[PDB]
Amino acid sequence: SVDKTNGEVTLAGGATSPLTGGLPATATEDVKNVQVANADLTEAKAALTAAGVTGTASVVKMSYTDNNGKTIDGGLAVKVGDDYYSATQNKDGSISINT
Amino acid sequence: AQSLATKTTFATTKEQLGDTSVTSRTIKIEQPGRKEPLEIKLDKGDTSMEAIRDAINDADSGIAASIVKVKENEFQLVLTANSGTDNTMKITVEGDTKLNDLLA
Amino acid sequence: ALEKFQTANTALNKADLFKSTVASSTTEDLKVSTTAGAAAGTYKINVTQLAA
Amino acid sequence: YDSTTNTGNMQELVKAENAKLNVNGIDIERQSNTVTDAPQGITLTLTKKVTD
């Protein structure tokens, strides 16, 4: 059981028992720190808030079309209303607004 | 040398010959003398006759494409063979059913 | 000397060269020519009138 | 003079007409005795009526 309030880790719910196997194949990668979801967009939210814009981040992948109908795609952008801030995703999946 | 031209005619490079919904259409080729079928994969900007011509020609696969101007403001598409019945071709679009209808 | 070399190399750099081609007519009444990208093969023509 | 009605004290000597032809069963019309699209890259100079 992870207490994110200060990063303190306790036995899961206090259940006094070791598990048979326990570790799933989806957990097989190690960690030293608590995690936060990339979809949480903490970086982008903080950046926009520090810029003074209501950056409760919602992200989309952009596409552009000309009169041809010919279409070409961009990266991820923060859909702040219709004010799309250019954004990027790192190798770890975290999102950061371009600066 | 065999060659084929489309029955329908169009006007502009803007012409969206394919279904915008389909992610990336694929074109398959076969010939009696051909070793393995050829494949052409596209982005969402390859709906045009010009795009088809560029793909086919730049593939450098021995099969070329060329556009013809039917009238003023009207075009058609043409294919190339390399002489001999061995190069006889079969073509199948494994993506947009509209292109399947056009080219089958 | 450098300018001469630039001239030659700049001329060579074009890719059209690698699509070069030559064509000939079966009849003298019609003249023909080719540009870059001309599709190789054979064609048949019919004539119904000259422009006026 | 008036093209639409052909009226006027002038006199029409040579009527205006467009070049007409066909390629491998593909009917084509062009506005002069030079064509540069049938097929693309190939160019023709026409001065007579010939078949096939």
Would you call D46 and C47 a contact, using CB atoms and an 8 Å cutoff? yes
Token look-up 């403001």 returns: B73
Q: Does C37 touch chain B (CB under 8 A)?
A: yes
Would you call C35 and D50 a contact, using CB atoms and an 8 Å cutoff? no
Q: Which of residues 22-41 of B touch C (CB under 8 A)?
A: none
- Contact criterion met (CB below 8 Å) for C33 and C20: no
What technique solved it? cryo-EM
Distances (CA, A) of B30 to B63, B70, B81, B86, B90: 11, 29, 12, 11, 5
Would you call A72 and B45 a contact, using CB atoms and an 8 Å cutoff? yes
Distances (CA, A) of B68 to A91, B50, C40, D20, D47: 47, 11, 14, 15, 22
Q: Comparing C-alpha atoms, which of B45, C46, A26, C18 is closest to residue D25?
A: C46
**What torsion do the CA atoms of D33, D37, D42, D48 make, to the nearest 10 degrees?**
-20
Would you call B1 and C42 a contact, using CB atoms and an 8 Å cutoff? yes
Distance between CA atoms of A87 and A74, rounded to whole angstroms? 10
The partner residues of B79 in beta bridges, in order of sequence, read: B65
Q: Comparing C-alpha atoms, which of D34, D4, D23 is closest to residue C31?
A: D34
Distance between CA atoms of A75 and D31, rounded to whole angstroms? 48
Q: Comparing C-alpha atoms, which of B8, B31, B10 is closest to residue B80?
A: B31
Based on DSSP, count helices (H) and strands (E) in chain A, helices before strands: 1, 6
Distance between CA atoms of B4 and C41, rounded to whole angstroms? 12
Best C16, C24, C30, C48 member to test D by mutation, with max D CBs in 10 Å, is C48
CA B56 and chain centroid, separation: 7
State the DSSP code for A33: S
Per-residue H/E/C for D13-34: CCCCCCEEEEECCEEEEECCCE
Resolution of the structure, angstroms: 3.7
